[PDB]
Amino acid sequence: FNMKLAINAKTITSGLKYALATGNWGSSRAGVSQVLNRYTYSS
Amino acid sequence: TLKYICAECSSKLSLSRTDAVRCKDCGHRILLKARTKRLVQFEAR
Amino acid sequence: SFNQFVDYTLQDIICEDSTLILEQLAQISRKYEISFGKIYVTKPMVNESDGVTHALYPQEARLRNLTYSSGLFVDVKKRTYEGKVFIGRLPIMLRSKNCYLSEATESDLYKLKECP
Amino acid sequence: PNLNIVLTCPECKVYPPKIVERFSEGDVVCALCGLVLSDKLVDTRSEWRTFNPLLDGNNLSTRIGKGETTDMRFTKELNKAQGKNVMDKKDNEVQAAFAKITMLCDAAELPKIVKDCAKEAYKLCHDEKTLKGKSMESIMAASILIGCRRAEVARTFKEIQSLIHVKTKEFGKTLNIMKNILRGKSQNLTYIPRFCSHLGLPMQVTTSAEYTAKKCKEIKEIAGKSPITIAVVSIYLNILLFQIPITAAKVGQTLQVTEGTIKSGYKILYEHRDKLVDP
Amino acid sequence: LRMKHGTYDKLDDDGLIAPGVRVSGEDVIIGKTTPISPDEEELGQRTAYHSKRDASTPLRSTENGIVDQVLVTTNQDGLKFVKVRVRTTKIPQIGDKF
Amino acid sequence: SGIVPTLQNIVATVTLGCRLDLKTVALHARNAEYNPKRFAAVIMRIREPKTTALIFASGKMVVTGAKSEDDSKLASRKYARIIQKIGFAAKFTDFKIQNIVGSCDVKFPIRLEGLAFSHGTFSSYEPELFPGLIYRMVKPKIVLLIFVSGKIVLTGAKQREEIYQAFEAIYPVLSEFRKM
Amino acid sequence: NTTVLADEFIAHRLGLIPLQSMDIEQLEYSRDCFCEDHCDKCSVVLTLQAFGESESTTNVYSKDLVIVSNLMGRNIGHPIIQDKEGNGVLICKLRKGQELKLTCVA
Amino acid sequence: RITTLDETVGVTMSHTGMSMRSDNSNFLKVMPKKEILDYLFKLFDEYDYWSLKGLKERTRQPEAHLKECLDKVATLVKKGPYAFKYT
Ligand SMILES: [Zn+2]
Ligand SMILES: [Zn+2]
């Protein structure tokens, strides 16, 4: 047996990092996360 | 080789091709590029 | 909200299914089950391609196109029925309790090159 | 047949010609007379702007599933008609290799370039008398070490052995052939820093060892029988040059090394302490 | 093979301009080439080169102004990569929106 | 060259021509190591000539540790005589040496890195388990193990003569690759 | 120029710095000289060195322009100083370590 | 709240990757034809429904003598109840 074969970090890491990078909250939910807008401070 | 500058350590670097992209004195991995020497001309318009 | 998620909702997500079992039957039945205990979140950092791992500040993340996150770790009990484990990295919101900047001072924010 | 096209100004003809592509006009012109040779140029970045053959070759693929407008009496048979041609292809052992090694290098926390070289290093050899099976691990255990080192990241045999238990022997024979597979188809420095971080040390202690280990290597002291060990002694050499508690016993298990090789290795160091003086 | 009719002289040896250099439209900013097999395609005039097809990045066809700063790092995977920033001054003009 | 490839082991096969009672062979011998739980062959070490031999239920004996064709041959004849004293009419028939492995020295330090790197096609190296190079020759077909100490381990011949020929061929390579 | 201002930004401020031009008829329109674009018969040359030395900020003023071409006795080119502390127009600010060197042509 | 691990980042990740250590927590670690026939007749006589395993364990001798020499006067069925039975 080994944990390292069982526990697969690349599950979580790649999960969150993907639902942030695209807006696809998964799908079924898109545009949840957008590139921050820095035209001017108040925007 | 050409001059570079650490981003934080801020030391002139002068590495070459196939050297590590890495700063002495801090293994910081960001380098700027040591602005040109030839003069540059603007108009005060 | 993010602060709340990191403090509580993370832990309670883990411990709602803290265990999972497995039993095999013999001629006496061997049974296995794995526990999930405390959870630990580091301060943000990156593991460089060489192998080295070090703190990651938000400037460096933006320049080098990294992801500003910190690792997750949980304790486990393995149970044979008749230490802390990496599980992945949590992207951090800036200025949140777990971010390097959360408590930094102005004169320090300039040092890190972050607009106050 | 030769099926080949070449352009040349039929009114200069002087050369293998001097022509330029005016892209923004969709033209190619004789750079001498400016006769336009051929026009209606087709774009070259917009093409892939709207958007693995090195592995997946010519037998193509397409992920077939269930849409919104299908009931389970048609969906599951798409899962029951896709299963009739998985053995004419050895490609299960092709993809399930990649999927496995992808599952490996990724779980191993490795750069996604190594993943490719191993997705390569499998695919290039992928069947040989030397291979002839041999547990199908040792390659995915060596093609990674290949894919690792070939991607300029070197890891110890034990380190992969942690990932996959290869009996340490099925590894060795499989490696030799593999390396020679590419040679026919045709570096321990990497260990100093990955170790320092494993001990959580500032850069200078690691900074120095590159000088010391190279200098200890450069003159004499073959020293080591798998120089993995005599790497670490540089840290131990240099950590004692500093005064930071990494006591020998803590070193060992953290890096899974014999303690004996340290002190005896450090024998050649408590005596060679002469020439490592940079400051 | 397959170079851009824009100039390359503004580059340095390492395929980068240096901060301070005034550039104009259709000037190669980042010089990159991807090696090709001598016999990979033989497209046109490969028989003299055998080496490499260029993949440099030219400045936009309508922009200009001075390179402001150039930084060089490695991505997560230790691959070199570079970010060039170009600075322009926009003076109000006739069709501009206020 | 000027260096004789010094044999360290000769492994040879001897057909005694009888189905030997390996139990009685072990019983009537003076110091013989035979138990079925390791092999189906009585292993005898005779100090003169000091050779170690495994003799099977087929009566075939393979002999190792000899320092010559004649060390092994005389040892095998003594082995057959011992078997006949045991009670089986062993006979030296269709003998053949199946292996002649030797170690000698050329004594000049070698750029083993140069050979292995430039003869990657022929020789492979992973210096993190075993510091020796492996080299092949077809004429004569000798495989040679090389180490920085100058030791040459020549193997792959029924005779020391192929050892000699490939050594006369490979010593010039060694001197060519001599590190200094 | 390692200040915190862009060049064309600074260059634009230099243009607006009002120079002494009482005796300006004794100059010529730079498209009437035959010089290789400029000479003392058609232009005045100044220069500006500044270096941030104190730990405090250090201000560059128009009074720090120094003429480095032969005026030929004509009375032109000096930066007008209307103020009472005798510093003219503030041009830039410098923190220690920051440098500005440039050459202007009026 | 969470004990946000106060260590340096470098040390903690050391054990996550290839630490080359394991098993620190024990868990899922995982010949006479006369005598053979005399026992084979004994195997046949004592229990005609004599499976090979019940015979091989009772053989306690080389596998050759029990399986081969007994194959003549003992008939072994393959399927059904009295299968593999030296009856
Ligand atoms: Zn023409
Ligand atoms: Zn003039």
Coordinates of C-alpha atoms in Angstrom, one line a residue, chain C residues 27-90:
Chain C
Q27 CA -12.0 -18.0 8.1
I28 CA -11.9 -13.8 10.9
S29 CA -13.0 -10.8 8.9
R30 CA -10.3 -8.2 8.1
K31 CA -11.6 -4.6 8.1
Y32 CA -10.0 -1.3 7.2
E33 CA -11.0 2.2 7.6
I34 CA -9.3 5.6 7.2
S35 CA -9.8 8.7 9.3
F36 CA -9.6 12.4 8.6
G37 CA -8.6 14.7 11.4
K38 CA -7.3 18.3 11.7
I39 CA -6.6 20.3 8.6
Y40 CA -3.7 22.6 8.1
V41 CA -3.2 25.4 5.5
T42 CA 0.2 26.7 4.9
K43 CA 1.1 30.3 4.0
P44 CA 1.3 30.7 0.3
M45 CA 4.3 29.3 -1.5
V46 CA 5.5 27.8 -4.8
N47 CA 7.5 24.7 -5.6
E48 CA 10.0 25.6 -8.3
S49 CA 10.6 23.3 -11.2
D50 CA 14.0 22.3 -9.9
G51 CA 12.4 21.1 -6.7
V52 CA 13.0 24.0 -4.3
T53 CA 10.0 25.4 -2.5
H54 CA 9.7 28.9 -1.0
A55 CA 7.4 31.7 0.0
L56 CA 5.6 33.3 -2.9
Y57 CA 4.6 36.9 -2.7
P58 CA 1.8 38.3 -4.9
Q59 CA 4.1 40.4 -7.0
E60 CA 6.1 37.4 -8.1
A61 CA 2.9 35.5 -8.8
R62 CA 1.7 38.2 -11.2
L63 CA 5.0 38.5 -13.0
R64 CA 5.9 34.9 -13.4
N65 CA 2.3 33.8 -14.1
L66 CA 2.1 31.6 -11.0
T67 CA -0.9 30.8 -8.9
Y68 CA -1.1 32.3 -5.4
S69 CA -2.1 29.4 -3.2
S70 CA -1.0 27.4 -0.2
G71 CA -1.0 23.7 0.4
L72 CA -3.6 21.8 2.3
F73 CA -2.7 19.1 4.8
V74 CA -4.8 16.7 6.9
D75 CA -4.1 14.2 9.5
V76 CA -5.0 10.6 8.9
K77 CA -5.6 7.6 11.1
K78 CA -5.4 4.3 9.3
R79 CA -7.4 1.6 11.1
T80 CA -7.0 -2.1 10.7
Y81 CA -10.2 -3.6 12.0
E82 CA -11.0 -7.1 13.1
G83 CA 1.8 11.9 9.5
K84 CA -0.1 14.8 8.0
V85 CA -0.8 14.5 4.3
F86 CA -0.6 16.9 1.4
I87 CA -3.9 16.9 -0.6
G88 CA -3.6 19.9 -2.8
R89 CA -3.4 23.7 -2.9
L90 CA -5.9 26.3 -2.1

